[PDB]
mmCIF file of C-alpha atoms and ligand atoms in Angstrom:
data_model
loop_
_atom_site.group_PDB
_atom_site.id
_atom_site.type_symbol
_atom_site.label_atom_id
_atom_site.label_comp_id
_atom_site.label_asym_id
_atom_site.label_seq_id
_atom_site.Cartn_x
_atom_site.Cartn_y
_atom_site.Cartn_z
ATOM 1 C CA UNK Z 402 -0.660 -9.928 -2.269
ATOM 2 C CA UNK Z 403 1.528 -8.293 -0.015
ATOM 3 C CA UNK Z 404 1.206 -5.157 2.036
ATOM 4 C CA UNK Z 405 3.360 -2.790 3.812
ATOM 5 C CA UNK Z 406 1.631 -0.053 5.758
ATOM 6 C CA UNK Z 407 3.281 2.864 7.475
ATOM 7 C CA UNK Z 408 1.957 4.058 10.381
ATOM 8 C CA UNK Z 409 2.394 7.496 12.187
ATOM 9 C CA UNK Z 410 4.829 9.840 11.004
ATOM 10 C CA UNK Z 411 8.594 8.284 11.001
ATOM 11 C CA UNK Z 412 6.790 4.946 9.571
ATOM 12 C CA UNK Z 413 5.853 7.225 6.603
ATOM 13 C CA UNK Z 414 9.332 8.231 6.305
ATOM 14 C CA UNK Z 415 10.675 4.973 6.428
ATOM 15 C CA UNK Z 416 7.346 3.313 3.720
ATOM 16 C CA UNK Z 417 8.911 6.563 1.456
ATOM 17 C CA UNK Z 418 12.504 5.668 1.696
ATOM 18 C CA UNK Z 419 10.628 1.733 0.885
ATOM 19 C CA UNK Z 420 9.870 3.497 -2.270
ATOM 20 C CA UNK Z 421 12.772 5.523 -2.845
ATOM 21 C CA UNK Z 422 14.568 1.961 -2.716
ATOM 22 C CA UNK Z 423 13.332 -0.569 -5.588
ATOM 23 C CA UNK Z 424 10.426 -2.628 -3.578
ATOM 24 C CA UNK Z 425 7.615 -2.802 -6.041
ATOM 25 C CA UNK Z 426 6.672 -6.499 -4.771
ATOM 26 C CA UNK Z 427 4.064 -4.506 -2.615
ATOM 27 C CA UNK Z 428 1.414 -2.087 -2.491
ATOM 28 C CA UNK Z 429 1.960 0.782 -0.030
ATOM 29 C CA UNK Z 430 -0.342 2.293 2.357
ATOM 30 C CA UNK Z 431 -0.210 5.432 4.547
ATOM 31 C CA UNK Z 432 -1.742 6.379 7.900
ATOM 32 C CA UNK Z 433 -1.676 9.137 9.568
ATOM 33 C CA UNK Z 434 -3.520 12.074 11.444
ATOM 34 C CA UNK Z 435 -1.107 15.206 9.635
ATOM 35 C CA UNK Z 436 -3.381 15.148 6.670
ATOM 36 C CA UNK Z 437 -0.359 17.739 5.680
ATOM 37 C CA UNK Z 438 2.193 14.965 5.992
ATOM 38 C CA UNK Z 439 0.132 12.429 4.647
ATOM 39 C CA UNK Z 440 0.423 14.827 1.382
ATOM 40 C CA UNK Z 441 3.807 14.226 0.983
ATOM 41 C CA UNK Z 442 4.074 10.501 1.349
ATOM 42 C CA UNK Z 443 4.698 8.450 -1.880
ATOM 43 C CA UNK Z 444 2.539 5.762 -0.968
ATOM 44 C CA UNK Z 445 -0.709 4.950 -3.285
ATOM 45 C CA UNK Z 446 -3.035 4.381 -0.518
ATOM 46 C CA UNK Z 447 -3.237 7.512 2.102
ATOM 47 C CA UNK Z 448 -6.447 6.958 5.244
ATOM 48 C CA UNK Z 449 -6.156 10.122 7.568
ATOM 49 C CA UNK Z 450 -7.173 8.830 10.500
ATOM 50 C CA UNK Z 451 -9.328 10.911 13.420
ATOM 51 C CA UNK Z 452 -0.051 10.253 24.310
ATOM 52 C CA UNK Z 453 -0.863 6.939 22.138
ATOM 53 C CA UNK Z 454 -4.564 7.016 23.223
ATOM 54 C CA UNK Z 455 -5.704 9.186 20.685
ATOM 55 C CA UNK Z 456 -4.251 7.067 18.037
ATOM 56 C CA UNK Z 457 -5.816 4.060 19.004
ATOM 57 C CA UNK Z 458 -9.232 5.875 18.489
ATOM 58 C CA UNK Z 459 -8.190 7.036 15.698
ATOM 59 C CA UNK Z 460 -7.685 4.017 13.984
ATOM 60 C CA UNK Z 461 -10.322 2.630 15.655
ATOM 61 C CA UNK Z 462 -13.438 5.416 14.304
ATOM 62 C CA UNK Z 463 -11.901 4.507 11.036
ATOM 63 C CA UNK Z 464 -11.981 0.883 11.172
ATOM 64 C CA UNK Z 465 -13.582 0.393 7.728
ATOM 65 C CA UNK Z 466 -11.515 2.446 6.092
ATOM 66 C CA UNK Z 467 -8.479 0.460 6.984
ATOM 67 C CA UNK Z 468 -10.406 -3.043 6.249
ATOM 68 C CA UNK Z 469 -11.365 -1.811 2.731
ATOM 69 C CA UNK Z 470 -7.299 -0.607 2.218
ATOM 70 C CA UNK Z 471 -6.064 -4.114 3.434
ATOM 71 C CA UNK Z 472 -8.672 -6.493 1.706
ATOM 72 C CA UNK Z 473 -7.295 -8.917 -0.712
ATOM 73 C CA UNK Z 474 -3.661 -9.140 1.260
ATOM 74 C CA UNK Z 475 -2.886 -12.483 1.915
ATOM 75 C CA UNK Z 476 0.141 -10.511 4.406
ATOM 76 C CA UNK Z 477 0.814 -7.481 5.598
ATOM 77 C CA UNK Z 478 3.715 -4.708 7.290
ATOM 78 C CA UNK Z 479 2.850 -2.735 9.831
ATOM 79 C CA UNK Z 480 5.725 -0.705 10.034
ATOM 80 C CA UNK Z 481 5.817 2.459 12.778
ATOM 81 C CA UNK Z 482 8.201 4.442 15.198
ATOM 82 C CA UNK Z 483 6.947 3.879 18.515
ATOM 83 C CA UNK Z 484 6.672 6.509 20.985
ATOM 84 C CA UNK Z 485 4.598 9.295 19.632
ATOM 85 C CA UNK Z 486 0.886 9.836 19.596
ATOM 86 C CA UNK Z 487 -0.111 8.021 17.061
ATOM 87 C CA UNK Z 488 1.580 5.273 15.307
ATOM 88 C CA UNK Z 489 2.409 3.996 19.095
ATOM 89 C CA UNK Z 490 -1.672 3.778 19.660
ATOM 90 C CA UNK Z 491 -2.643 3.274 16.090
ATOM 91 C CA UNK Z 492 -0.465 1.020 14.733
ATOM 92 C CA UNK Z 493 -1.575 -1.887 16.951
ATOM 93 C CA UNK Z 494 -5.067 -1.412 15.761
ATOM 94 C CA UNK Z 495 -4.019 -1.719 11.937
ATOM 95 C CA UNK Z 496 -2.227 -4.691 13.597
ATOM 96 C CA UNK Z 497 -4.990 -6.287 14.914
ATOM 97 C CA UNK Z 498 -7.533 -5.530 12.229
ATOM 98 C CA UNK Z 499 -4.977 -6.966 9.553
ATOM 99 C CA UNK Z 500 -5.174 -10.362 11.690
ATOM 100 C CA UNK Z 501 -8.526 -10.692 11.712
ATOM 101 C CA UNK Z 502 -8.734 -10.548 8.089
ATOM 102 C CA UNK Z 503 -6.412 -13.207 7.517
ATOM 103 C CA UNK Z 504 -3.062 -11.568 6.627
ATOM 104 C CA UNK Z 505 -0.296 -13.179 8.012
ATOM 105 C CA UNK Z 506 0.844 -9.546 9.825
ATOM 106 C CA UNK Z 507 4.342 -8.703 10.679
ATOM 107 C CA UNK Z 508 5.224 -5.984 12.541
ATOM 108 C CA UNK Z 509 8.635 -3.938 11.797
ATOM 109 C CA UNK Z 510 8.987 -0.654 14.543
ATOM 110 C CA UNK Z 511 11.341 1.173 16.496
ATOM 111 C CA UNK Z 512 12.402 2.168 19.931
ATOM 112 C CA UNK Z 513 13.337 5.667 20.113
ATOM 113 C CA UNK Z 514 16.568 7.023 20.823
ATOM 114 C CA UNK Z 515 17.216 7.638 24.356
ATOM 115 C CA UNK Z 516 18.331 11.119 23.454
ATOM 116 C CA UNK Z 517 14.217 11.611 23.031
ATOM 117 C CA UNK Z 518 13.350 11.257 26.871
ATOM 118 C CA UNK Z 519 11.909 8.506 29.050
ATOM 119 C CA UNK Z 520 8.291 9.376 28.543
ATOM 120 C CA UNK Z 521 8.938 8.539 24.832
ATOM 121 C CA UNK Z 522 10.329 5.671 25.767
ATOM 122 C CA UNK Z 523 7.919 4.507 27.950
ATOM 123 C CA UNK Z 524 5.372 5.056 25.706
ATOM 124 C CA UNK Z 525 6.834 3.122 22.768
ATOM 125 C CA UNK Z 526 7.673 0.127 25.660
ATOM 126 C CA UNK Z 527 3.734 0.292 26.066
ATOM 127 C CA UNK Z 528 2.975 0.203 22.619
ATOM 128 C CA UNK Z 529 5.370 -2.492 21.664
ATOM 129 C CA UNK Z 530 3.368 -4.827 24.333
ATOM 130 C CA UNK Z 531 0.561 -3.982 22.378
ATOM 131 C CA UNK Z 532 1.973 -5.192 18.979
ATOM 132 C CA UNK Z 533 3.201 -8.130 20.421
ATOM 133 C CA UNK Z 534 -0.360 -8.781 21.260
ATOM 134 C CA UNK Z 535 -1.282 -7.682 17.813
ATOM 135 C CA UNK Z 536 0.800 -9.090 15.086
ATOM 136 C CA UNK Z 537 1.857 -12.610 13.854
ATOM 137 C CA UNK Z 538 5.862 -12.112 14.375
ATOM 138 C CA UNK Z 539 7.247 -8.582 15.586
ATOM 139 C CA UNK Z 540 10.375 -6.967 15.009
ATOM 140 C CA UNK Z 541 11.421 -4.729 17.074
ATOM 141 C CA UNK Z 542 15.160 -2.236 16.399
ATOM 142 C CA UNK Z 543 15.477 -0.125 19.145
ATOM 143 C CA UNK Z 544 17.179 3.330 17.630
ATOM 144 C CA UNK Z 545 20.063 3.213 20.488
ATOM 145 C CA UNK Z 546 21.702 0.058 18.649
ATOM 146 C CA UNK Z 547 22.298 2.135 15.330
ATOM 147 C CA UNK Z 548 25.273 3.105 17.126
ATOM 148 C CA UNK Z 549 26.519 0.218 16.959
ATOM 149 C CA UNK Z 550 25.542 -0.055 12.998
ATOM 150 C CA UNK Z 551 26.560 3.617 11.650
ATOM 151 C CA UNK Z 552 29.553 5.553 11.156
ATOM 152 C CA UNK Z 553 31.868 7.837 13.491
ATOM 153 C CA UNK Z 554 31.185 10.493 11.067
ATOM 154 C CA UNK Z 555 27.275 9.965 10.791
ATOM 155 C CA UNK Z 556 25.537 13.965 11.340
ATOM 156 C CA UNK Z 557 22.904 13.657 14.612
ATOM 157 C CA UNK Z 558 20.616 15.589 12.164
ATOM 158 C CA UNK Z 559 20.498 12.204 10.072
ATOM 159 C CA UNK Z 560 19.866 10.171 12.252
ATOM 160 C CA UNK Z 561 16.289 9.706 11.992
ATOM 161 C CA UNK Z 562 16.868 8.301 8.171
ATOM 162 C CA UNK Z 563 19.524 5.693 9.301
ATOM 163 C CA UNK Z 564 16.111 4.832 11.196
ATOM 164 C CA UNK Z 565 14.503 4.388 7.928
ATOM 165 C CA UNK Z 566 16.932 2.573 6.198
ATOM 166 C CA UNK Z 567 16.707 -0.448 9.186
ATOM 167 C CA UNK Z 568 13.435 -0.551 8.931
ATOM 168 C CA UNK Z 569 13.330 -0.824 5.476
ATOM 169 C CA UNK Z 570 15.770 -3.523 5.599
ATOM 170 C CA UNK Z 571 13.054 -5.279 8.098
ATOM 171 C CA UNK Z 572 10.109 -5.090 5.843
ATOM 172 C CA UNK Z 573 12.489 -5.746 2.108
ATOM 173 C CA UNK Z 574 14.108 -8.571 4.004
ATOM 174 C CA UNK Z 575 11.214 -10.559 3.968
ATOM 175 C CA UNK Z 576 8.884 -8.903 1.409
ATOM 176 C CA UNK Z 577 11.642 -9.518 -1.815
ATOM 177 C CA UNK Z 578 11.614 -13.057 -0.795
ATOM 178 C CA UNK Z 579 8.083 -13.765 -1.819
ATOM 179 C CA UNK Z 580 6.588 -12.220 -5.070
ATOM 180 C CA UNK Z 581 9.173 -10.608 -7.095
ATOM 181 C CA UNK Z 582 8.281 -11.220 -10.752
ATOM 182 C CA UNK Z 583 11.933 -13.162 -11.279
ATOM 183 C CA UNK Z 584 10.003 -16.040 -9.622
ATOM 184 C CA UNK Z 585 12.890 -18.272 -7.469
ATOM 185 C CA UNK Z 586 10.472 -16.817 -4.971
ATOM 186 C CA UNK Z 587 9.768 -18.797 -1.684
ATOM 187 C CA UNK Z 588 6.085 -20.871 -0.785
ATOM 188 C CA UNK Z 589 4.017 -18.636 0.951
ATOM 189 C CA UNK Z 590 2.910 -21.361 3.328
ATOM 190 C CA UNK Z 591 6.381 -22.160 4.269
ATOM 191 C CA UNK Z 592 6.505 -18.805 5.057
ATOM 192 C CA UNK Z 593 3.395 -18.636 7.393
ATOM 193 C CA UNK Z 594 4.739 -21.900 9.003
ATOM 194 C CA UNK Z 595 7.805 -19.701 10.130
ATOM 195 C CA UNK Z 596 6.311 -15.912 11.355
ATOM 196 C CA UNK Z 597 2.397 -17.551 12.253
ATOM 197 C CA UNK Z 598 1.559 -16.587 15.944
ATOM 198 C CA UNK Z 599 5.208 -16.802 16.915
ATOM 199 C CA UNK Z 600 5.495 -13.484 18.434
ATOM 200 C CA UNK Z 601 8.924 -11.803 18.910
ATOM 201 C CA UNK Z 602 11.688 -12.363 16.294
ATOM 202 C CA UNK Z 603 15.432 -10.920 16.132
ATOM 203 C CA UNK Z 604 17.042 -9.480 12.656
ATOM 204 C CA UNK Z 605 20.386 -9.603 11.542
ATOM 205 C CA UNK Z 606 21.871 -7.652 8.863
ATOM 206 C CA UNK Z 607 25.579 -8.899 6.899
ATOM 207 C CA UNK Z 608 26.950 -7.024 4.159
ATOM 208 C CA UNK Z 609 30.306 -8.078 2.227
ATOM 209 C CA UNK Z 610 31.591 -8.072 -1.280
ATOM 210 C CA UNK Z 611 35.245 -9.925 -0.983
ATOM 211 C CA UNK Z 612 36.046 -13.024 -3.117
ATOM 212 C CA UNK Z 613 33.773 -15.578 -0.016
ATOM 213 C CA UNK Z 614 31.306 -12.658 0.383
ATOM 214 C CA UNK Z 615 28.554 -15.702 1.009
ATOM 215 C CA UNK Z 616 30.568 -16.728 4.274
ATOM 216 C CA UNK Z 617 31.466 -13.066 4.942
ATOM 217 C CA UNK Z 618 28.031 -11.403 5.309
ATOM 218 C CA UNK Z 619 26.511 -14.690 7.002
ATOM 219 C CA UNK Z 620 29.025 -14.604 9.839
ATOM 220 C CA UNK Z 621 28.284 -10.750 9.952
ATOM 221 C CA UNK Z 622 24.617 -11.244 9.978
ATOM 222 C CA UNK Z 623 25.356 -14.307 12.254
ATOM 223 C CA UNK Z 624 26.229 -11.526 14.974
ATOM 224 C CA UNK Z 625 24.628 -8.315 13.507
ATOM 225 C CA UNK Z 626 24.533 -5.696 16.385
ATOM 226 C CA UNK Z 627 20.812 -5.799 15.288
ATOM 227 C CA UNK Z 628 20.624 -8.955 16.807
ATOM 228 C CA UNK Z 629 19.567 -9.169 20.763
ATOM 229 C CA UNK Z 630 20.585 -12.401 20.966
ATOM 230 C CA UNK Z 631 21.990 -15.557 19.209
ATOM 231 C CA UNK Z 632 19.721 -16.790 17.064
ATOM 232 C CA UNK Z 633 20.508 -20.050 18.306
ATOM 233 C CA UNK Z 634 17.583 -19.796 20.779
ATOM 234 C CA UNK Z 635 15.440 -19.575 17.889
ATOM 235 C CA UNK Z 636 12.911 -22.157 16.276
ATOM 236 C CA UNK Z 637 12.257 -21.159 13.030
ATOM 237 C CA UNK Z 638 14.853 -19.001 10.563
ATOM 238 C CA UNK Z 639 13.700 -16.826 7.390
ATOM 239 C CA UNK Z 640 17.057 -16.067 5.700
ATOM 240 C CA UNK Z 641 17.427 -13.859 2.718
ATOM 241 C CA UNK Z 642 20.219 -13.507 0.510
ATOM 242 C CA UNK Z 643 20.041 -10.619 -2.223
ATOM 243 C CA UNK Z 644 22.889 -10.246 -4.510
ATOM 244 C CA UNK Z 645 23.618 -8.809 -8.127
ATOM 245 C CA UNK Z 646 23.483 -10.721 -11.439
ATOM 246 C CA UNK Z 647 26.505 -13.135 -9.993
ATOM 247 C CA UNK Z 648 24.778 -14.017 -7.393
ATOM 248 C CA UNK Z 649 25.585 -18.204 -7.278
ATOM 249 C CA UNK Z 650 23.010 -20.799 -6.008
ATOM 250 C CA UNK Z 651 26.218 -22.005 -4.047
ATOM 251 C CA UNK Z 652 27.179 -18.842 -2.278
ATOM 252 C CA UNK Z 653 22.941 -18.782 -1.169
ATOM 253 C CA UNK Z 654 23.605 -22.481 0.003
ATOM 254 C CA UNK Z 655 26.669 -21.512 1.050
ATOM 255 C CA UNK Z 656 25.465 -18.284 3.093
ATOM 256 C CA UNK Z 657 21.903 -20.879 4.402
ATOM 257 C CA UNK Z 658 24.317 -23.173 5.850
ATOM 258 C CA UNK Z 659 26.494 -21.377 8.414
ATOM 259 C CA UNK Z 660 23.388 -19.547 9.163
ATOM 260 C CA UNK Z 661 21.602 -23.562 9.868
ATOM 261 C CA UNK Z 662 24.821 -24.202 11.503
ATOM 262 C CA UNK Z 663 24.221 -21.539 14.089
ATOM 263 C CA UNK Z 664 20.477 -22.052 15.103
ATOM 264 C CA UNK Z 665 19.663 -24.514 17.143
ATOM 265 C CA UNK Z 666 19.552 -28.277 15.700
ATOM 266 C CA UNK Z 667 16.323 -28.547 14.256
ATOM 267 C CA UNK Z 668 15.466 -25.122 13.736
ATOM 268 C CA UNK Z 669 12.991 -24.729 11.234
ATOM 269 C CA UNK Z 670 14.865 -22.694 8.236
ATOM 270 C CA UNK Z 671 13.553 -21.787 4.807
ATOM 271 C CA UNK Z 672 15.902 -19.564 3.007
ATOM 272 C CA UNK Z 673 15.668 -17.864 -0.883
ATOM 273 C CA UNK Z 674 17.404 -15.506 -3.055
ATOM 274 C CA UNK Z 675 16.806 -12.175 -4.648
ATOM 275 C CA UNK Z 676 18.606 -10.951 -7.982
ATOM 276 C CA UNK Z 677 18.527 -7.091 -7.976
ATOM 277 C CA UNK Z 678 21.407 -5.781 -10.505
ATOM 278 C CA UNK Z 679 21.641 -2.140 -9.161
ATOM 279 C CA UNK Z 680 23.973 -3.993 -6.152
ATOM 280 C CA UNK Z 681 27.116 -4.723 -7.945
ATOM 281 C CA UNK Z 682 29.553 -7.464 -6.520
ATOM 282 C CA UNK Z 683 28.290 -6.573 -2.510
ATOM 283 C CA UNK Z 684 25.698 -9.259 -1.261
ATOM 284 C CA UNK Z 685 23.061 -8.334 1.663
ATOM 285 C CA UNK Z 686 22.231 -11.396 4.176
ATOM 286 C CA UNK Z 687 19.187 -10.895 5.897
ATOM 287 C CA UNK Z 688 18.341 -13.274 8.522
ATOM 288 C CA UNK Z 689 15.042 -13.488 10.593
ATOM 289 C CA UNK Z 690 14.839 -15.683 13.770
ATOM 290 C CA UNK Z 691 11.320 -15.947 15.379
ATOM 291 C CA UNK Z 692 9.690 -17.558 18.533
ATOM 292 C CA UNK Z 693 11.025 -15.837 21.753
HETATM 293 N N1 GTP K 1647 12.445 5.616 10.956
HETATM 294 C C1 GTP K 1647 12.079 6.816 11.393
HETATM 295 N N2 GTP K 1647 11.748 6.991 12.723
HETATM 296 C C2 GTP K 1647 11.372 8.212 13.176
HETATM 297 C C3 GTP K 1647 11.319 9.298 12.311
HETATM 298 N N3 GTP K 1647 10.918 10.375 13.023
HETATM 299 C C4 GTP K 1647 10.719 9.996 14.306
HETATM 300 N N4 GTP K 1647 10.998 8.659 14.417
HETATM 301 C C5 GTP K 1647 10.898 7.841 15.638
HETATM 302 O O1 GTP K 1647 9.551 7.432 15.790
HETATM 303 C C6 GTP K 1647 9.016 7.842 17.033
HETATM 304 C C7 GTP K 1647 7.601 8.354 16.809
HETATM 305 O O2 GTP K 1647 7.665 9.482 15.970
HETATM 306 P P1 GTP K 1647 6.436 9.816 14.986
HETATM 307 O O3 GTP K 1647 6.103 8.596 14.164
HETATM 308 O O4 GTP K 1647 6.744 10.986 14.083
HETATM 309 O O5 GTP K 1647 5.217 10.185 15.967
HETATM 310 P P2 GTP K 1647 3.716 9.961 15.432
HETATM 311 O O6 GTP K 1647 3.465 8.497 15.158
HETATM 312 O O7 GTP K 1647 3.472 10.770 14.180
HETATM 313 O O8 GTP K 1647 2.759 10.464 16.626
HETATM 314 P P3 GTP K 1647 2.420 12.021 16.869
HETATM 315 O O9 GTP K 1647 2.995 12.460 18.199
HETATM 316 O O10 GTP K 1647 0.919 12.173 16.891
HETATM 317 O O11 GTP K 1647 2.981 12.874 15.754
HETATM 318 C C8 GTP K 1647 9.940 8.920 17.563
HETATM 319 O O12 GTP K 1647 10.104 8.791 18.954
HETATM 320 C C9 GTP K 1647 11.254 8.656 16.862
HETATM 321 O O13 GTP K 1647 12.071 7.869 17.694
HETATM 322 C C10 GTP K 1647 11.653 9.130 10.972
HETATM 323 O O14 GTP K 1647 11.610 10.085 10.196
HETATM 324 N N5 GTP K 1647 12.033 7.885 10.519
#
């Protein structure tokens, strides 16, 4: 039972492009205080809840109603763009209440742009000390490094869904790996070995289609922009490989071990695949380091 829950505005936006995207391994849950935006998310589960203080109260006055909407996860998302009122204050809460309960959490959210002003920065900086403190493993894409990621001729006025597509990439990444119905699936306590109270974890993204595609998108996700850092300082490595129907066992063990080549000698690495047929001949490598 897995759980992704979007928290504040943009996290909505990104749990709705989540949607949009096939990624029916989960059940989706909204918070928010726009009851009027809440209204147009897709997600099943909506809680309206109540400067990132009055989130956390928020969440906090509705405590129950989030424990009821988690219960019965055995891990959860908490996915959220830091810096505004609430999912910067809130989404720690749903954080720390998901914790409590058990769920292996995992927190996906995003720095703001530094076209949206220091203050908003310094608030998200804030609140992503307070996930840290929160959540199992954290993820953390600040929007600046999409720069790096998008096109010269990517409009400013879409920016904000380039945002959603990274984070959905953080949350699917990990999420297809462990219960899709085509069941090559992953052990859920291998998993828990890898993101349990780790802390702060790097992502890196690979994309290629050519006739080695497997050692083409790992050497891309090997040194995704995403990426802070090498993810040879890293312990433990979560590697996903999702491909079409031709996706090969080899090109997976292919992709796994450049990827184990890379981390440090006896990093921990567990590493699955995911057939989804609407990709063609391109394969995605999603890689998740942990532990820094
Ligand atoms: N992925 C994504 N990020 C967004 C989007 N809109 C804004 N963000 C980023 O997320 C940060 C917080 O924005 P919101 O989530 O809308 O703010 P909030 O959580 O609703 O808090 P409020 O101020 O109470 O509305 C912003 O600084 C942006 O950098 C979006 O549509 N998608």
């Amino acid at each position: 039972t897995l759980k992704v829950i979007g928290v504040g505005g943009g996290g909505n936006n990104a749990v709705n492009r989540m949607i949009d995207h096939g990624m029916n391994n989960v059940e989706f849950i909204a918070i928010n205080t726009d009851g009027q935006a809440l209204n147009l998310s897709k997600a099943e589960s909506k809680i309206q809840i109540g400067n990132p203080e009055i989130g956390k109260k928020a969440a906090e006055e509705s405590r129950e109603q989030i424990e009821d909407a988690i219960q019965g996860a055995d891990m959860v998302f908490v996915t959220s763009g830091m810096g505004g009122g609430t999912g910067t204050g809130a989404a720690p809460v749903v954080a720390k209440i998901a914790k409590e309960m058990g769920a292996l959490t995992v927190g996906v959210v995003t720095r703001p742009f530094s076209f949206e002003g220091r203050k908003r920065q310094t608030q998200a900086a804030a609140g992503v000390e307070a996930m840290k403190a929160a959540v199992d493993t954290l993820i953390v894409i600040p929007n600046d490094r999409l720069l790096d990621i998008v096109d010269k001729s990517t409009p400013m006025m879409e920016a904000f869904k380039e945002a959603d597509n990274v984070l959905r990439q953080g949350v699917q990444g990990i999420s297809d790996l462990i219960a899709v119905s085509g069941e090559v699936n992953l052990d859920f306590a291998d998993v828990k070995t890898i993101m349990s109270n780790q802390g702060s974890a790097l992502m890196g993204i690979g994309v290629s289609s050519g006739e080695n595609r497997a050692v083409e998108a790992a050497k891309k996700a090997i040194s995704s922009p995403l990426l802070e850092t090498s993810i040879v300082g890293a312990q433990g490595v979560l590697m996903n490989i999702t491909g079409g129907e031709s996706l090969s066992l080899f090109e997976a063990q292919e992709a796994a071990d450049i990827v184990q080549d890379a981390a440090d000698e006896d990093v921990n690495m567990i590493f699955g695949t995911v057939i989804n047929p609407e990709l063609q001949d391109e394969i995605v490598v999603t890689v998740i380091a942990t532990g820094f």
